Amino acid sequence: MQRCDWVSQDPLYIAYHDNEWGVPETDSRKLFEMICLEGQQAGLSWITVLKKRENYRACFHQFDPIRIAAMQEEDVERLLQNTGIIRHRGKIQAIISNARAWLAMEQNGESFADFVWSFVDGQPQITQAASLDKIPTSTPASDALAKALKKRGFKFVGTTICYSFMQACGLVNDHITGCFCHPG
DNA sequence: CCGTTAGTCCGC
């Protein structure tokens, strides 16, 4: 089975690639979880975060924004000691900030899913790249999404993070042409 | 440019 260049031999990474990455996600809560996990990747490899994803789901209340938004300074200082996540105060606080930011949107008219999908025009763009070096790391759309998220109070959401989120949640489909998951 | 994680790599 030929797969994208970034997939290691780790079966956890293989299942994530085959079953989740690039598959259009339209659920607001799932999208919220993914923008949070992409921010947790900053400066690190994605596999580090993926391997910890079950720990994140346990520590952050299955990414239910109401439960997250109720977390306090004491929770942050507790999580800073938890070796199952990334022990970085700014990143832990970012998940809490992001949950409050999502609530401020959703209690006030704006679907997070409608909002992120507004940065793509119709069907997800399918890459024409045969190799990872020909796939962009950010685009005009990811630039726009990052700027809009920051305006709305989100943290750890720059253009490169936003583009990786777009790939992951299938707002673009960046499976290389030779990958068995490419919609060839 | 400087600071940071977790993890890899490299030199002593």
Next chain:
DNA sequence: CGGACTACGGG
């Protein structure tokens, strides 16, 4: 073994 190095926040 300890240090360098490695997409944000910062100055």
